[PDB]
Amino acid sequence: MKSVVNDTDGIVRVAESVIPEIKHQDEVRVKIASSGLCGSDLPRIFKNGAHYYPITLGHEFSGYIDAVGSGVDDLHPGDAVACVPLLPCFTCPECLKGFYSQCAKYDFIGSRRDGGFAEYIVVKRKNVFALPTDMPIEDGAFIEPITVGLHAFHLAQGCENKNVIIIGAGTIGLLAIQCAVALGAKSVTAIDISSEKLALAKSFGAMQTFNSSEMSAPQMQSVLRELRFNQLILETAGVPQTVELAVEIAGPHAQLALVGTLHQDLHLTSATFGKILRKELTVIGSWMNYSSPWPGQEWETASRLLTERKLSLEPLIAHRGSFESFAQAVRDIARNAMPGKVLLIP
Amino acid sequence: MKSVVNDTDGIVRVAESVIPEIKHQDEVRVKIASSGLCGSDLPRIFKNGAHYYPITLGHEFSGYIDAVGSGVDDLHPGDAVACVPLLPCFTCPECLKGFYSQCAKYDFIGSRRDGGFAEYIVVKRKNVFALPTDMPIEDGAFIEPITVGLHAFHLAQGCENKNVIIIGAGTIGLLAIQCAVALGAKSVTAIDISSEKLALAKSFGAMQTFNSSEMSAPQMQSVLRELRFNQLILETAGVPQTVELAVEIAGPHAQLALVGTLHQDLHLTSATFGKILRKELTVIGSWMNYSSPWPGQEWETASRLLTERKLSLEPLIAHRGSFESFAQAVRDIARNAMPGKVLLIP
Ligand SMILES: [Zn+2]
Ligand SMILES: [Zn+2]
Ligand SMILES: [Zn+2]
Ligand SMILES: [Zn+2]
Ligand SMILES: [Zn+2]
């Protein structure tokens, strides 16, 4: 079988290996149908940011059950699933509190173990999430990235009647816009360094967009004056400038959910830091996308919003291809901006 | 009358001026009995931190009503009061929502206007808070700093049954320790560079202390393992190193309340920033100490805790003196650490 394997210093290869076998009663094998590249994968591929090399990435995927372990009674060959890539230990104090993303001993498909850029994969039963039978299987690869935004909304106690601001118009951000609209946000504003996805953002329901390469924070704050209360700002870009921006534009008692992980240091002036206090912001760290009961309401919500046609995935997709096509698309990224969702379609 | 007036390049003078007159029907004049120096005043004096110079500081004070304006019907000459130093406009959208500390046009006694390092001051009726008749007048000068900690607890939805960590053993911090104990915290831990102040913290009920000049963050986090859940951390020191320390030591889903204003920039590593997300911290900016109904439950609680003998003020006090003595004590501090509460007793 084929897979995409990344090695040190940005080399991408398509490799051949044996189909993995089920080794435990609680495992299943998935024949992968659709598998997406995450923004978080770019540092793993090009910036020697993976836990090990060689590695096969991929934690945003769907497919059909090919086989099940003898202890699996609620799934059958042919069933459609999405991958739930985190595997908590389920027995430490954090896990028993439902703090799965704080498990000290968790596995992660496509980061801590090999993942879904492959024709087949073997995972635990608890690492798959059954899809509605009428859901196009390709759509299943988007459930995991949908739940990222949903998890942040959940930590913020919802987005209903809030003035939502999404910073970063990558896939996670664009999905978050769609979810905010569907979940009853009063308004949604989208902010990004480029202007391309911003028209797209408006098509997804953002009522306005700010190009941060063309507007300063005070200019944005001025436009936001009427919408300054009950803000929920999601920082999805994961760069110092956008974390700073979020604090600078925030209205009184805004909630600021941090979704994007930084790869450079954050220097805040005393002035900017002071605004966190003066505005009495609530800054909410968000990590992964799970809650109790496992894998969490985020996953059910994502599935439901999709089935209800409240989300639109097609415009998000920049590339569809099998292994060679996908590998070259990944290579073509180098480390510039992500064009859109690059899908591997085995 | 005398007052303490500080000037550019850190000069502290004792000045003579005319007693202020009541000019409006809703003003009162207070003859000041006890007036404290805040940690926040040191940058105003020795670091070009004030809004203007020359300036008379002082926002932690008590005294007796000397005279009232024709429109004041509920206060009388001889009444004991503490100063409520913030004056919001009460007519902007922030104020109408009870967000007084985000008022777009607020005054502040001892920062934006001259304050209580003086024999007499004229303020609005809304700027005084009546004390119980049996409360020792000097105790009144501590109500405002008590409400600082209480306001942070309030924003965090209380400290009851929580594992409270107070970072900074200055007056604000030590008072917050006492309040946390009185309000039913599960545990209280104090962190500071001073073994002195930390012994005091233990005497106030802190079950353990960490000397940050001797212990590293990992060492502290190791000790905190048993108490890592349901943490509420108050950062009261207002220096970059203690904000960093707070994130580094925090347990899973800890609440971090930021009380201390920075007068230096904050440089967080990408790793430290990452911990905000990975631990799913909630970082709560806390600003001043007010809520609806004006001036807020914080003030009632402060008064009550004092009357109920749940707080201990004497050990907090490092100096009592009239104007020359007080002024020299302030000069002796410079940009060294605060010894404890320095009181002006006119
Ligand atoms: Zn991801
Ligand atoms: Zn665990
Ligand atoms: Zn103060
Ligand atoms: Zn106002
Ligand atoms: Zn720096």
UniProtKB/Swiss-Prot annotation, chains A, B:
GO molecular function, one term: galactitol-1-phosphate 5-dehydrogenase activity
Matches recorded under SUPFAM superfamilies: GroES-like (SSF50129), NAD(P)-binding Rossmann-fold domains (SSF51735)
Cofactor entry: Zn(2+)
Annotated InterPro entries: ADH-like_C, ADH-like_N, ADH_Zn_CS, GroES-like_sf, NAD(P)-bd_dom_sf, PKS_ER, Zn_alcohol_dh
One GO BP: galactitol catabolic process
GO CC annotation, single: cytosol
Protein residues bound to Zn(2+) 1: C38, H59, E144
Cofactor detail note: Binds 2 Zn(2+) ions per subunit.
Keywords per UniProt: Galactitol metabolism, Metal-binding, NAD, Oxidoreductase, Zinc
EC numbers for this chain: 1.1.1.251
Catalytic reaction equation(s): galactitol 1-phosphate + NAD(+) = keto-D-tagatose 6-phosphate + NADH + H(+)
Residues binding Zn(2+) 2: C89, C92, C95, C103
CDD domains: sugar_DH (cd08236)
One matching Pfam family: ADH_zinc_N
EC supergroup of this enzyme: oxidoreductase
PROSITE patterns: ADH_ZINC (PS00059)
Protein family: Belongs to the zinc-containing alcohol dehydrogenase family.
Function noted in UniProt: Converts galactitol 1-phosphate to D-tagatose 6-phosphate.
NCBIfam families membership: PRK10309.1
UniProt-listed PANTHER family: L-THREONINE 3-DEHYDROGENASE
Protein name as it appears in the record: Galactitol 1-phosphate 5-dehydrogenase
Gene behind the chain: gatD
